[PDB]
From a paper:
Movie frame micrographs collected for these VLPs, at two different cryo-EM resources (West/Midwest Consortium for High-Resolution Cryo Electron Microscopy and SECM4) yielded capsid structures to 2.84, 3.79, and 3.25 Å resolution from 29,596, 7564, and 5234 particle images, respectively, for BuV1, BuV2, and BuV3. For each BuV, the first 32 N-terminal residues of VP2 were disordered, and thus residues modeled for BuV1, BuV2, and BuV3 were 33–568, 33–567, and 33–572, respectively, with the last residue being their C-terminus. In VR-I, two additional residues are inserted in BuV3 relative to BuV1 and BuV2 and VR-III contains conformational difference among all three BuV resulting in Cα position differences of up to 5.0 Å. VR-IX is mostly structurally conserved among all three viruses, with only the BuV2 residue 540 being conformationally different, VR-VI and VR-VII adopt different conformations, with BuV1 differing from BuV2 and BuV3 at VR-VI and BuV2 differing from BuV1 and BuV3 at VR-VII. The melting temperature (Tms) of the BuV capsids determined by DSF were 64.9 ± 0.2 °C for BuV1, 77.3 ± 0.3 °C for BuV2, and 73.4 ± 0.2 °C for BuV3. The Tm values obtained for BuV2 and BuV3 were within the range reported for other members of the protoparvovirus genus, for example, MVM. BuV1 contains five cysteine residues while BuV2 and BuV3 contain seven each. BuV3 does contain two cysteine residues, C59 and C520 within the same VP2 monomer, at a distance of 3.45 Å, positioned to interact within a hydrophobic pocket, but they are not engaged in a disulfide bond. This proximity may be contributing to the stable BuV3 phenotype compared to BuV1. Significantly, in all the structures determined to date for parvoviruses, either by X-ray crystallography or cryo-reconstruction, there has been no disulfide bond observed, despite the fact that cysteine residues have been positioned within interacting distance, similar to BuV3 C59 and C520.
The BuVs, along with CuV and TuV belong to the genus Protoparvovirus, which prior the BuV discovery contained only animal (non-human) infecting viruses, and are classified as novel Primate protoparvovirus 1 species. The VP ORF encodes for two overlapping structural proteins, VP1 and VP2, sixty copies of which assemble their T = 1 icosahedral capsid in a predicted 1:10 ratio. The VP2 monomer extracted from the refined 60-mer capsids of the BuVs contained the core β-strands (βA–βI) and α-helix A (αA) observed in other parvoviruses and large loop insertions between these secondary structure elements. However, unlike the animal protoparvoviruses, the bufavirus capsid contain three separated protrusions surrounding the 3-fold axes, as has been reported for members of the Dependoparvovirus genus, human parvovirus B19, and the HBoVs.
Residue numbers in the entry:
A (entry chain Q): 279 to 474
B (entry chain F), D (entry chain R): 33 to 572
C (entry chain Q): 524 to 572
E (entry chain Q): 33 to 82
Amino acid sequence: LFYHWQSTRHIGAPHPTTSPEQEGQKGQIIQDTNGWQWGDRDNPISASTTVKDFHIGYSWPEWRWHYSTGGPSINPGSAFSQTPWGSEVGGTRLTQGASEKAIFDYNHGEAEPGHRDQWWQNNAQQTGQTNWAIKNAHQSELRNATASRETFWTQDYHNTFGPYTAVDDVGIQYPWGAMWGKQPDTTHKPMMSAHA
Amino acid sequence: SGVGHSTGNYNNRTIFHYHGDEVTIICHATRHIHLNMSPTEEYKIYDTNHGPEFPNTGDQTQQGRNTVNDSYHAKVETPWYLINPNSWGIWFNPADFQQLITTCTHVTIETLTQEIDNIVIKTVSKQGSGAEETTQYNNDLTALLEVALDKSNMLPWVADNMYLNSLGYIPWRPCKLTQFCYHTNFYNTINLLEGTQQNQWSQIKEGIQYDNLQFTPIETSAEIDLLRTGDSWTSGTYHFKCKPTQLFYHWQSTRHIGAPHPTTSPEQEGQKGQIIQDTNGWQWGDRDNPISASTTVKDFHIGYSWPEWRWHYSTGGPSINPGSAFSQTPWGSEVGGTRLTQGASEKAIFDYNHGEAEPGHRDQWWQNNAQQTGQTNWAIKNAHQSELRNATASRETFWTQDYHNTFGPYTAVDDVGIQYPWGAMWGKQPDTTHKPMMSAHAPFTCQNGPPGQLLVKLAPNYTDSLNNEGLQTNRIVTFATFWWTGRCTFKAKLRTPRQFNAYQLPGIPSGTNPKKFVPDAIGRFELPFMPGRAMPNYTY
Amino acid sequence: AKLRTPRQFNAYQLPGIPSGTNPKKFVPDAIGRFELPFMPGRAMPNYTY
Amino acid sequence: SGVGHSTGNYNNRTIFHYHGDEVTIICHATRHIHLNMSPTEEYKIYDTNHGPEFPNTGDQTQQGRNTVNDSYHAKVETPWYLINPNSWGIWFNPADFQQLITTCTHVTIETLTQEIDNIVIKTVSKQGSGAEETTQYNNDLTALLEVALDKSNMLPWVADNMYLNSLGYIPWRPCKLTQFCYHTNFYNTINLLEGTQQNQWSQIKEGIQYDNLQFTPIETSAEIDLLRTGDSWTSGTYHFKCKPTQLFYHWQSTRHIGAPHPTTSPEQEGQKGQIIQDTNGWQWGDRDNPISASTTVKDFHIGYSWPEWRWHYSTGGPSINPGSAFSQTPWGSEVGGTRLTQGASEKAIFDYNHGEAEPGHRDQWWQNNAQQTGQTNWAIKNAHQSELRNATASRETFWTQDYHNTFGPYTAVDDVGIQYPWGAMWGKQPDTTHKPMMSAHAPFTCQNGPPGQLLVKLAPNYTDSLNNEGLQTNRIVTFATFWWTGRCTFKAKLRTPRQFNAYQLPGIPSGTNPKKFVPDAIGRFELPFMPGRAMPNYTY
Amino acid sequence: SGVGHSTGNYNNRTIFHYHGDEVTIICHATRHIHLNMSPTEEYKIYDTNH
């Protein structure tokens, strides 16, 4: 019944820093520390390159149109919120993270009889699980120096779901959410359900 | 016994007992902690600089390449200190660990206990003109040490060994604590696509989010024990439940597992067995001829390609999303150049206290990790072709560059395994609907809650005038030293030889000079790295 | 369901009606027509790790 | 255990247990008190100035309007200090209180216990020329702390939270005690009618009355416990007997309670239901037509008009005689102007120690209290007419201005309810033939005697020469710090939803910025006000 | 009871019970359905517009 605000950056030991004496001031990052790092980096020691034993959320192509027998259809992504980015209700209204919209009749809680209304759950409270694939990058070698113009790519659009990732279901939804759902009989059942 | 009676005792040893089928390891560790008076007595919440190499706003040279470094965050700073034995180097003597990876296939943790005694608290009194001032250290028979341990894990974790901040690895040196502080939500989100050319970067959101911010003091979470000198403290036995981690490395790939492709044995030496033209076997696709060992069917695959190095720009991001743990030694990579960082490769910076020889100097390692092969999938070297048929693919329909995630239901992979001395031992499991399947850096992930964190603070002693002014010189300067004796018991099943010829037994890294691992004239020495994962074995 | 206990010092933001919505639309009207509110939820923050 | 053994322990938490029909709340609190040497060791009795704004005699400008401020009194000053946990902020964490007013309809107190350990007493020795003097704090292993608690309540009360003088609301800060002193009779009586124009003022009687004066030392009233360092102390469990206080606010008035006047429902929206001309019902007076909902009979009335603000000039007077607790928000009153103070409206000044952000700064609140409506009777808005008949009253026989007390056998009213953090918890009941029916500021009024007061004094340490001279520098400067751990258990029956649509749940005040209630970069933060009385409910 | 006797009953409520460590929620719901005669009595299989 609770939402997670933490990301891979919010989980861990914070990078050691020097506390501010006056307010307001910002604690300066300590130059010389000792800690694990990914790759060959020794200096600078960063909180981005620091090792962590799991990752939160995963990038996904969106919106995937699967052309199947009977297709096309949408293949869902993560449930994360776009409010950390520039998205707001009333514009620009980014639909990126898996975002459900509920059309409902007067019988289902619309005021006007014989009229239609919608909702579009954002869902604004899930942050830190937010991975929006257009904003991402990969570089060939991880070293003290920053990457060259070549060997640094940003555009894809690739599935980062893996054995390390940890993610959240959309959770229950009221009034219009489903309660239970059927489990398909296949050799590999889904690990977690999208809407149910 | 309060004064003049010693409560604690010194035991630092590890002992093995073989039942003939399985080993029981009981390792004791005891350290002398030097605890100092807290800088401020009040909790704080503040925001930080981005980092040393992060660009000043408006620097478009290097585009968004240099933005990866922050290292920006926001946290709540408690006036507490965290003594955590999460490193391997705490519990295992280098030679006592060498016997573990030699004689055992895999190991679990069972219990952990901790005891804090015996406390000594002193105060600093400086009397003199100043030019020739004389400090005098005299102990407070009545003064408090506050010991807070949360068995219910109400606090954020922040006990991971990373940013080493852990007890030293050398039993006779003193240890310094690190201050307990944890994160509060913030948005670092960085847009590196802004521009007409898409190259330029900017940061849209920064700063703390105070609406939903959670603030947990130590006082409300856990019950605190106030200890004077004659007092002792104990955490009670804590039982892990965790899966065993393998002590052996896998050399097999999808090519090394299976039935070898039938061939004609060589009559003379040296000669190579020729591949038999006409055989019968399963194949992928439409291939009948040639029957190959590359296209032959197999019911699982080993390792997976991954984009590297992935920079996830998240809330608080960027951050790295890890890949497989494989070694680059099958490719052209060597220490001393060209030193390919490709497979997930960890580098350990460590202080003199953590096994560097020079005092106040920094040293690094960079585990390769050279012994994991056959799990090696390096995405720049890979290809896919549209149709699999007898004829080789056309120039079109054959692609090589991506960079795509091949993790799937078929793949089988290995965790990095334990690491010595600097590796973490256990880790906390995040509560999400989908837990991670395997942990990157931590061998053990507690099924139930992790062992409670042990916080310690030196209770304040106030001068006669509390408020003055202005809060200037309110407390008398004070420090404490106490002894910490833990023990954790392990359980491991012992290895038996599966081969004819002699193994290469574990030990010191190959090129290193053995004199650096034994004390020096000044008395400074360094501990060796054991992988390990020091033995080969068969996957399939 | 197992009940929640406060894990923090300062006061939570408790669940309720969506922020911008006008409360009169969730209670019956002169004609008697009203709308039910959306609750997420997932209405409370917590610690993942 | 006397020296080097810690007697006490730190617990600060509150825990709930739901039995399915009722909640049991057990809240622990523990604080670190800094106690200082008493200014003088001897009791004193003296008379005081009137006040800052009180006129010098013979100032007839403003007439008797400015005489209200004194603030004049006479008292006996004991050399003792009073640690009283009478505030709500002591026991309840802001979030732990938010769960009380959310899930519970009303609450009682059951028990209270208190414990004082563990004592640390030091002395200040200043050695040096003076230009460069060096203080040295060294503890007295043999020195006394005097703990006096009167279970029989022989002393005057003076434990009311007003003039806050109470333990801090933040567990990790130190607390300072306030000195115990109480009133002795005096006559302040002020005549503001003296003159030919009746406007001028003068004071007829002033000063202490020594004939019947009562002087009660602490030594004769209660038994005193002398505690050295290794000693501990406990007050034993004290059981209240009190009535539950409602956690919900009433929106109904005499107009909102009843059967609504029959009307014709509107066909279209929006439209207003028209009042039905011909109905049958009871009415006051001789009215037949028009039948109104104002003149309709009802068997009780809600709220009462009161003269405000009444200044009672008494012996020792002036003083305010309170009115009803109602809110002015139905009228034009808003925070930020015009800010009508009419209904009984309390304003809380509080120190940094009590939840102000800035050290050594003052802040205020002024509870409105905006949520109590329908009890609102504001006497300037009211009228009475001689005869109640079909026709409206004549110009004569219809009056509007008074200003009269409408409290009577029919009226039904509400206490202010609990207040957080700064509200008092319990209060003493005066012994008179007619006890008050309901208390103004205190939620709980002990049926039997109130919980005994706990006084503490640091016993004097004398220099070798006691009498010299002249009484100059007789005692050695000394201070002490000890820990105080109370717990009080509560009992509350939990709320269940009585409505269809969603409630507005309690929380932070509406306009306030949430960053001020969580610690700052310096570490200074403020606690929020909860009314409460945070939920609506039906009176009738 | 077949005719002139009411078999069912109306309960629409939800009630909570706290055991001090865990909540037990029992929610009743009752609705009045208006059912109409089926358009055709026979099963059908057909294909649709895009």
